[PDB]
Structures are given as C-alpha cells and as structure tokens.
C-alpha cells in the first residue's frame, strides 16, 4: 500500500505578538485549511478521513469538531519521537486507514538581542554556535546563508511559485487578514546582517577554548504563526473520490541539532537511493550553521538546497513546519518537472525525520 | 506485510505507596523486561529493533540507552495523544520499513477509595461510571458481582499456572526476588465484603433525578506499578532471527468512558468479522459499570469476557495496560487452542482502541 500526497496547503506565516495573525486563534487557522480543501474538492467523502494529525511544539480533537469533520475521524496531537507526515504515511501504508490529514499549527525561549523576537531555544542557539565553531563556519558564512534564504524566498514569492498552496487567512466577514509571508526581509544585505548583535552569549569538546558565537536574529529563524495540512491517502481512496495524486511518499525514517543528517542517510538507505538520485533537498532552517553542517556532511549541491528559501526568511512555524516544507517541495517538483525531493527537520529532542517524495 | 507478535512479557503488578515495587524506578522495570527478552532470545540482532514505544500516564529514549539497545533504536513516548503503543507498533511493521518494534508501557508512583486512600483513579471518571450504572440499570449488586468474578478468575488463572510464562519477577541489584505475583489481588473477596464498602464518588441526562452511586474501591480498579512489552515484527524479521510467531495482528482501529464500544465495532468491520467469530474478549476493567455496558451493548457472552480476571483484581497499570492485556490474550489463546481475541481499552481522552489478534 503506497501512500500518496493528494494535496498540501498552508497559511501564510504571521509575525508573532505584533503581526497579522496575532488575533487569529490556532483552531481557526486549522479549520480554514479544511474549508479550503472542501472548496477544492467539494465531492470528498470525509468518512474516509480517519485522523487529523496535528503537530504542536486538545487541538487535534477540538479541530475535528470545529471543522465539522465526521465523529468517526480521530485527532492525534504530536509534540515524542513521531512526526505528523511520517505518521500519516505509516497509517496509510499499513492499509487500515484510507485518508489522513497531517500537519500542524503554531500560535503564540531564545530571543534576539535587539527586537526581543523568539528564535527560538537558548541551548539550541549555543549548540548552533558550537557547530559553527567545530566545523569552521564563519560569521560571514552563516550570514551569506541567511542572505540566500531571503533572496530565494523573494524570488519564489515574486515568481508566483507559492500561489497555488498559500491560502489567505480571512476574517469572519471575509476581508483578507494576511496573504503573504510577512516575516520576510527581502531588503536584507551582508552589511545589514554584520551589524546584528550575537544572540547566544562545553567540556565534551575540550579542545575548543572559546565558542565563536556567530548566530543572530538574522541567521536564526524567527518563530511565526501558521498552519499547514497535507492530505495523504491510498490509491484506492483517491481514485474512489476522484482525486489526482500529486506525489508518492517513497520512504520515511526517523533517527542536539545534528539529527537530520543520520535520518537522511537512513531514509536514502530504505529507498535504495543515493544523494545523486535526489533532485531537491529541503531542510528546515532553524539556524544557518545547522544547514551548513548538513550540506557539508552529505556533499549536498548548493543549487539543490532550500531552493525556494526557508525559515530564516519566511519564519519557523514550529508544529506546522513539516507540512509547510513538504508542500513547498510537492509544488516545486511540479514547477521543475523534477522527480524526487528529500524533506527533513528536527522532531526533535536530538531526533530527526527525513522523508523522500516522488512526483 | 503482516504484523506478528513474537513475544509478550510483563512485570507483576505492585501496590502503590505500600507495595513491593515502590522503590523500583520505572526505568528499571522496563530494562528488566529487555534483559529477560535477551535471556530468551540471546542470538537476536537488536539492530532490527527500530523503536521502543512506551505509554506512560524522556522515558522511552532513556530506556533505550539504559538497556544498551542500539543507538539506531529510537524511543517513542505516548503520554503524543490519540495513539496506543501496540497499535502504533503494528502499523509501523505493516508499513514495511520497520522490522521489529518493542511496544508497551510503564507505571510507577486523582480519585481514591474513601477508607484505605488508595488511587482508583480520576474523580469525574468515577462519576461517569456511576452515571452509566444509573442510565443502564446496573445495581450495586451487579457491579459487585462483576468485581467478585474478576477476583475469582484472576485467582483461577494464577493458581492454575496460566501466567507462569509471561509474568517475569522483579529482582533487586543482588538478584533477590522483590515481587513475583500480582499483590493487589484480593482472592478472599466476598459479596458481603464488597457491600460494606463506602461509595467513592458521591443536565445532559435531564431525565435522571439522582445518580445511583454504586462504585467503590472494590468494583473500580486500583492503580498499580508495572511494565510490559510486546515484541512485534514482520514475517521476514522473525525468520532471519528464527523467532516463532505466536499471534498475528489481524486489525486494529481507534475511536467519558464509552470509547471501547465503537472502536470494537470498527475493528470488527475492518477484519470482516462479527462478534461470533471472536473466542475471547479482553476489555480493561477501569470500572465495573463500563465493562457491563460494553458487554450489554455488544451482546458479549459471559464466558468470553475477561476470562483470566482483570484490573479490578490485578490492578490497573495505566500506560503498561495495553501490552499486559495483549499478552494475557496471546497466552490464553495458546492455552485454549483458540483462534481469535479482541483486546480493547481507553487511550484515552475519550478515545478507545480495539485490536484483533489471531493465534499463529
Ligand atoms: Cl542556499
């Protein structure tokens, strides 16, 4: 039993505290995606949707009720060792569930020194600086990575790449509240990044005399509000409801900011694939050094990594991350007419998840 | 891809506060079961064990490490809501990418009984149980007779030797036996004894004037210490390691105290089975009224239900419950040369889970 992605949508991402989604309750952010799916697929028999799976870093069960999904639909809420998309594929592959909604939601800690904005866990930030210290990534390296995120995000937005999947959030009278990723800073420059103050100032690594603190509010991802859902199902369930499969989930696997690397090696193993076989690599951008280390570890070509930008630009939506970056790849495989993407992030108490999809 | 159960072991159950496992750390209860699986299958390649999944009401990750399981084995903690250990393990194996999985749980020290101040176990849960008794017409005598039969059938199973293969004694750091039996059991229980007990829990159902409070510390299950583990795997994993499959997991499904009923109807639908096709029904005994309602709802024969006793007698081990009652059925199918059992419990923010196994 193969698991296919039939749809993958998401909310634009709102800045927390003083942004556009601050008054919108997380439930309503999730129910609006269900309502968009219904507009897209009005004939859909929801009796086949066995679970809504929500990552939150009783909303899954409450969301089912507020959306008016069937009472036969369960709610699964995830913070240990699992991930939403990975869980939905295993359910469907097991052959006892027919359609699953999988994704997550975030709605308002490490903080950047000048803006007081969440970026987002203190010891993670120190680890990030340790990685840069151990691996020899300079302040200019991590800033150059941040710049390329903002640039690729800007190119993706202005190029229309996200038009199909990014669903405007509207108020209870229909006025658009937010239709774009407002955390983006497309005016970002290397000179601007260099003035920013470092934000995170160990005995296992006893040869390190001093940590070279290089991460800031500009090369670490700010936390943003948002929701995302992926509709996963069997072949028979989708051909039942006249849905067109958009990608196949080839393999998934699971394995303190270094987790994505081995989970990626493992998923590649399970699928009988190598790095050369993957057209696009998508890794959540929690901190620039962590992405650079992943790239350095696996010899990942620059032109294949986070090709439409990542969380440094658009924001880190915590629980919603997995469904957002999956959908970003489902869409980008189609725009490129490319074949395979590998999507990976932290679960993540030290633990990573990696998933290979096929167009 | 079929999911098979290759082994199912469990700790005896310790009374909380004054009992035999009160100073045994929950981590050690789990590690002991791993070390027992090793004694049984010493040539087993643990590299095929992809996860340890533990329900508890960072212990799964710490368990993997303390047990010296491989660094490739991950930990999954269900405390992750709407999921159940054994059901999650089955689906992983059936998915085809995981070869062997350890699934179970652990409890180690709220509604209490009015006299001995034990725990039994959430106050409003007990009110719902009384409410069910009132709506359905179960008397105090009905709920007590149910408790009595739990004690009797557990007494029977224990003295008959039924649990000898699966209940693994807990031992101290010098090897002395700390606990080898289900010490919460009260085999001397009588109807006269149960009737003296004080009730513990005294607009949707606007036609009910007063709730008939019938639940006590003798017909609601006390919470106990314990751990349990089920080893689930694929056909090929078992044949590489030369393990003998004991049962196949036919189906499993998921759906305040009524959840097991629809989950059971659902699992039955998925497997293409009726109630007549099941030899044994095993439902966790949180409260006597809830077991009687399940039985009454689905027309379950008395001789098929909780046939070796349940939590009222042996104790409710919270997170360990699913693996313990699963193992109870793997053994009892074997002992009867019977074919199928249905194992069910609350997850359970209102959510029930039911799983059908078939003896292989
Ligand atoms: Cl890049």
Q: What is the DSSP string of B289-332?
A: HHHHHHHHHHT--GGGBSTT--HHHH-B-GGGHHHHHHHHHHHH
- Distance in Å, CA A145 to ligand 1 centroid: 6
Last residue of a domain, one of B210, B229, B249: B249
C-alpha to C-alpha distance for B321 and B345, rounded to whole angstroms:
8
C-alpha to C-alpha distance for A245 and A4, rounded to whole angstroms:
6
C-alpha to C-alpha distance for A2 and A251, rounded to whole angstroms:
10
CB A288 within 8 A of CB A219: yes
Experimental technique, in short, is: X-ray
Mutate to test the interface with B, among A48, A94, A263 (most CBs of B within 10 A): A94
Domains identified in chain A, total number? 2
C-alpha to C-alpha distance for A137 and A293, rounded to whole angstroms:
9
CB A122 within 8 A of CB A200: yes
CB B143 within 8 A of CB B219: yes
Alpha helices in B137-287 (DSSP H): 140-159, 191-195, 235-240, 260-271
The verdict on A150 and A267 lying in the same domain is: yes
Q: Which residues contact B135 (CB under 8 A, 6 or more apart)?
A: B205, B208
Structural domain of residue A348, as residue ranges? Answer: 119-160+250-357
The verdict on B49 and B27 lying in the same domain is: yes
Query: Tokens representing A78?
Result: 């995830």
- Distance in Å, CA A359 to ligand 1 centroid: 23
C-alpha to C-alpha distance for A268 and A262, rounded to whole angstroms:
10
Q: Is the peptide bond before B198 cis (omega within 30 degrees of 0)?
A: no
The resolution of the experimental structure, rounded to one decimal in Å, is 2.2
Q: Give the residues after which the backbone of chain B is interrupted, taking a C-to-next-N distance over 2.5 angstroms as a break.
A: 57, 79, 109, 202, 255
Q: Give how far Cα A69 sits from Cα of A11, A73, A106, Å.
A: 20, 7, 21
The verdict on B315 and B232 lying in the same domain is: no
DSSP one-letter code for B121: -
C-alpha to C-alpha distance for A67 and B300, rounded to whole angstroms:
35
φ, ψ of residue A342 in degrees (nearest 5): -120, 125
Note whether A78 contacts B: Cβ–Cβ < 8 A: yes
Q: Which residues contact A253 (CB under 8 A, 6 or more apart)?
A: A86, A263, A266, A267, A269, A270, A353, A354, A355, B97
CA angle, B169 as apex, B163 and B175 as ends, to 5°?
155
Tell me if residue B195 falls in helix, strand or coil: helix
Across the interface, whether the CB atoms of B60 and A82 are under 8 A apart is answered: no
Q: Which of B48, B72, B53, B78 is nearest to B63 (CA)?
A: B53
CA angle, A340 as apex, A336 and A346 as ends, to 5°?
110
Residues in chain B: 360
- Looking up residue B25, the CATH number of its domain turns out to be 3.40.47.10
The verdict on B96 and B173 lying in the same domain is: yes
> Using CB atoms within 10 A of its CB, is residue B38 exposed (0-12), middle (13-18) or buried (19+)?
middle
CB B323 within 8 A of CB B89: no
- B224-233/B100-107 β-pairing: antiparallel
The verdict on A267 and A325 lying in the same domain is: yes
DSSP one-letter code for B244: P
C-alpha to C-alpha distance for A170 and A261, rounded to whole angstroms:
39
Q: Which of B272, B270, B234 is nearest to B95 (CA)?
A: B234
Across the interface, whether the CB atoms of A74 and B82 are under 8 A apart is answered: yes
Q: List own/partner pairs for B69-77 with CB under 8 A and 24 or more apart.
A: B69/B34, B70/B46, B72/A255, B72/B47, B73/B46, B73/B49, B74/A81, B74/A254, B74/A255, B74/A351, B74/B50, B75/A80, B75/A81, B75/B51, B76/A80, B76/A81, B76/A82, B76/B51, B76/B52, B77/A80, B77/A81, B77/B53
- Cα pseudo-dihedral B218, B220, B221, B223, rounded to 10: -100
Q: Which residues contact B350 (CB under 8 A, 6 or more apart)?
A: A61, B256, B259
Residues in chain A: 359
The verdict on A65 and A49 lying in the same domain is: yes
CB B292 within 8 A of CB B146: yes
C-alpha to C-alpha distance for B57 and B320, rounded to whole angstroms:
9
Last residue of a domain, one of B249, B281, B305: B249
- Which chain A residue has its CA at the smallest distance from B93's CA? A94
C-alpha to C-alpha distance for B138 and B310, rounded to whole angstroms:
19
C-alpha to C-alpha distance for B150 and B307, rounded to whole angstroms:
8
Number of neighbours of residue B208 by Cβ within 10 angstroms: 12
DSSP one-letter code for B221: P
Taking only residues 83 to 102 of chain A, the set having a beta carbon closer than 8 angstroms to any beta carbon of chain B reads 89-91, 93-96
Query: A138 vs chain B: nearest CA distance in angstroms?
Result: 31
CB B283 within 8 A of CB B307: no
Q: Which residue has tokens 């209870």?
A: A172
C-alpha to C-alpha distance for A298 and A268, rounded to whole angstroms:
12
C-alpha to C-alpha distance for B300 and B261, rounded to whole angstroms:
11
Query: Tokens representing A25?
Result: 């309750």
CB B322 within 8 A of CB B86: yes
C-alpha to C-alpha distance for B146 and B152, rounded to whole angstroms:
10
C-alpha to C-alpha distance for B286 and B125, rounded to whole angstroms:
9
The verdict on A124 and A103 lying in the same domain is: no
CB A104 within 8 A of CB A319: yes
C-alpha to C-alpha distance for A327 and A184, rounded to whole angstroms:
19
> Using CB atoms within 10 A of its CB, is residue B166 exposed (0-12), middle (13-18) or buried (19+)?
middle
Q: Which residues contact A140 (CB under 8 A, 6 or more apart)?
A: A190
CA angle, A283 as apex, A280 and A289 as ends, to 5°?
125
C-alpha to C-alpha distance for B234 and B158, rounded to whole angstroms:
32
3-state SS record for chain A: CCEEEEEEEECCCEECCCCCCCCCCHHHHHHHHHHHHHHHCCCCCHHHEEEEEEECCCHHHHHHHHCCCCCCCEEEEECCCCCHHHHHHHHHHHCCCCEEEEEEEECCCCECCCCCCECCCHHHHHHHHHHHHHHCCCHHHHHHHHHHHHHHHHHHHHCCCCCCCECCEECCCCCEEECCCCCCCCCCCHHHHHCCCCCCCCCCCCCCCCCCCCCCCCCECCEEEEEEEEEEECHHHHHHCCCCCCEEEEEEEECCCCCHHHHHHHHHHHHCCCHHHCCEEEECCCEHHHHHHHHHHHCCCHHHECCCCCHHHHCECHHHHHHHHHHHHHHHHHHHCCCEEEEEEECCCCCEEEEEEEC
C-alpha to C-alpha distance for A183 and A16, rounded to whole angstroms:
9
The verdict on A224 and A278 lying in the same domain is: no
Tell me if residue B53 falls in helix, strand or coil: strand
CB B123 within 8 A of CB B111: yes
The verdict on A63 and A124 lying in the same domain is: no
Q: Which of B349, B320, B326, B122 is nearest to B255 (CA)?
A: B349
- Which chain B residue has its CA at the smallest distance from A74's CA? B255
C-alpha to C-alpha distance for B35 and B50, rounded to whole angstroms:
17
Query: Tokens representing A152?
Result: 């690729």
Chain A positions in Cβ-Cβ contact with residue B96 (cut-off 8 Å): 93
Chain A positions in Cβ-Cβ contact with residue B351 (cut-off 8 Å): 61, 74
Kind and range of the H or E element at B335?
Answer: helix B321-336
Across the interface, whether the CB atoms of A349 and B51 are under 8 A apart is answered: no
Q: Which residues contact A204 (CB under 8 A, 6 or more apart)?
A: none
Q: Is the peptide bond before A348 cis (omega within 30 degrees of 0)?
A: yes
The verdict on B14 and B84 lying in the same domain is: yes
CB B48 within 8 A of CB B237: yes
Query: B301 vs chain A: nearest CA distance in angstroms?
Result: 27
The verdict on A233 and A271 lying in the same domain is: no
CA angle, B256 as apex, A95 and A29 as ends, to 5°?
65
Q: Which of A311, A309, A281, A310 is nearest to A296 (CA)?
A: A281
Among A77, A79, A81, beta carbon nearest to B75: A81
C-alpha to C-alpha distance for B93 and B84, rounded to whole angstroms:
14
DSSP one-letter code for B282: E
Q: Which residue has tokens 């639909």?
A: A73
- Distance in Å, CA A313 to ligand 1 centroid: 12
End-to-end CA separation in angstroms for chain B: 15
- CA B97 from chain centre, in angstroms, equals 27
Chain B positions in Cβ-Cβ contact with residue A252 (cut-off 8 Å): 97
Query: Tokens representing A67?
Result: 């959306």
C-alpha to C-alpha distance for B75 and A245, rounded to whole angstroms:
32
CB B82 within 8 A of CB A60: yes
DSSP one-letter code for B286: S
Across the interface, whether the CB atoms of B96 and A95 are under 8 A apart is answered: no
The verdict on A227 and A283 lying in the same domain is: no
Last residue of a domain, one of B249, B282, B309: B249
* Sign of the CA dihedral with B218 first, then B220, B225, and B226 last: positive
């Amino acid at each position: 039993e193969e698991a296919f992605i039939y749809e993958a949508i998401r909310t634009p991402r709102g800045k927390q505290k003083n942004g556009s989604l601050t008054e919108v309750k997380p439930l309503n952010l999730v129910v609006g995606l269900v309502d968009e799916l219904r507009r897209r697929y009005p004939d859909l028999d929801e009796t086949l949707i066995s679970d809504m799976i929500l990552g939150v870093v009783d909303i899954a069960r409450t969301a089912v009720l507020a959306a008016g999904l069937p009472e036969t639909t369960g709610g699964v809420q995830l913070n240990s060792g699992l991930e939403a998309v990975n869980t939905a594929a295993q359910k469907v592959r097991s052959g006892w569930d027919d359609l699953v909604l999988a994704g997550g939601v975030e709605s308002m800690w490490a903080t950047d020194p000048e803006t007081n904005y969440r970026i987002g866990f203190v010891p993670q930030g120190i680890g990030a600086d340790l990685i840069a210290t151990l691996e020899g990534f300079s302040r200019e390296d991590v800033d150059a990575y941040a710049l390329r995120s903002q640039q690729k995000a800007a190119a993706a937005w202005s190029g229309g790449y996200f038009a199909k999947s990014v669903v405007p959030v509207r108020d209870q009278n229909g006025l658009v509240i937010l239709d774009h990723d407002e955390h983006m800073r497309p005016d970002t420059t290397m000179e601007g990044l260099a003035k920013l103050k470092t934000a995170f100032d160990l005995q296992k690594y006893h040869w390190v005399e001093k940590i070279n603190h290089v991460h800031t509010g500009g090369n670490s991802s700010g936390i943003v509000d948002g929701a995302a859902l992926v509709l996963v199902g069997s072949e028979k369930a989708g051909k039942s409801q006249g849905l067109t499969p958009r990608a196949r989930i080839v393999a998934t696997a699971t394995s303190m900011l270094t987790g994505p690397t081995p989970a990626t090696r493992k998923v590649l193993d399970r699928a009988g694939l190598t790095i050369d076989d993957i057209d696009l690599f998508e890794l959540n951008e929690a901190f620039a050094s962590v992405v650079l280390k992943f790239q350095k570890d696996l010899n990942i070509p620059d032109e294949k990594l986070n090709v439409n930008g990542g969380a440094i630009a658009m924001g880190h939506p915590l629980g919603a991350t997995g469904a957002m970056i999956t959908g970003t790849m489902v869409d980008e495989l189609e725009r490129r007419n490319a074949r395979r993407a590998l999507i990976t992030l932290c679960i993540g108490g030290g633990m990573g998840v990696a998933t290979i999809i096929e167009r």
